[PDB]
Ligand binder design. Structure first.
Ligand SMILES: Nc1ncnc2c1ncn2[C@@H]1O[C@H](C[C@@H](N)CC[C@H](N)C(=O)O)[C@@H](O)[C@H]1O
Length: 262
């Protein structure tokens, strides 16, 4: 259909099992989680290992200044807690509150003791779509249930964005919101309006797998929404037609350290 994003989606759903798994990691940056996995088994809760691949993703963003976490942090759809625990290590942050659905099929928050864990409070069993908004200085959201249907994803992304705006009008100046399907017309229009009222821009995280078109709307980014999205659709589409396959590119999963913060 229209938009490069839609052709990408069509081509993805047409791949065989083996090519789909090969393609999703091609040329993306991927942190090694071996040590984190063995620490979980041995119960090593103070080794400083992140609880998921999510922290390395948020680190990429914060390290490039796409946002500057500060004050009270609320993390919607915290899952295991990768973003909460990473935010707990930032000096400007003083409180981290995470909410996640939990329950069968969903990740439960993992309680570990990486640096600043005492400032973190995660509550499971909370479907954020029904929870009235709360005040915060930094708002984070990483919700986006994928679907083979681009229309389903468009609807789910709009739902997220309308939910997120309820927390934004409260005052959070700093934010990072995952936009599951940014290429569909309704999300493009919704984002253009959201960008007018709250600034920021769409950024493609190189740690994301090629099997998802997800991009992050962060407060300290800018630029045309259509341009940014199409640019990403092109990179994703180009990775399907390579003749030389190099697989995922290694990067160390940085240690969060341990201890508590005053
Ligand atoms: N309606 C919802 N309300 C609250 N949480 C949700 C909802 N839908 C999905 N989720 C959670 O959102 C999470 C998405 C994850 N990718 C978050 C990972 C997290 N950012 C990390 O770094 O570890 C999942 O754990 C889902 O269970």
């Amino acid at each position: 259909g229209r938009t490069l994003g839609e052709v990408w989606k069509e081509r993805l759903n047409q791949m065989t099992k083996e090519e789909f798994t090969r393609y999703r990691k091609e040329a993306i940056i991927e942190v090694d989680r071996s040590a984190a996995k063995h620490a979980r088994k041995e119960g090593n809760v103070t080794g400083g290992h992140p609880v998921s691949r999510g922290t390395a993703k948020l680190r990429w963003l914060v390290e490039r200044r796409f946002l500057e976490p500060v004050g009270k942090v609320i993390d919607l759809g915290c899952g295991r807690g990768g973003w909460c625990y990473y935010m707990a290590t930032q000096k400007r942050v003083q409180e981290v509150r995470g909410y996640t659905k939990g329950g069968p099929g969903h990740e439960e928050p993992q309680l570990v003791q990486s640096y600043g864990w005492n400032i973190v409070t995660m509550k499971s069993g909370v479907d954020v779509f029904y929870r009235p908004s709360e005040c915060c200085d930094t708002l984070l959201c990483d919700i986006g249930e994928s679907s083979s249907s681009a229309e389903v994803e468009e609807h789910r992304t709009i739902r997220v964005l309308e939910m997120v705006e309820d927390w934004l009008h409260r005052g959070p100046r700093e934010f990072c919101v995952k936009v599951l399907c940014p290429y569909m017309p309704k999300v493009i229009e919704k984002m253009e309006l959201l960008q007018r009222r709250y600034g920021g821009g769409l950024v493609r995280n190189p740690l994301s797998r090629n099997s998802t078109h997800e991009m992050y709307w962060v407060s300290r980014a800018s630029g045309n929404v259509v341009h940014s999205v199409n640019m990403t659709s092109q990179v994703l589409l180009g990775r399907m037609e390579k003749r030389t396959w190099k697989g995922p590119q290694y990067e160390e999963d940085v240690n969060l350290g341990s201890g508590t913060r005053a």
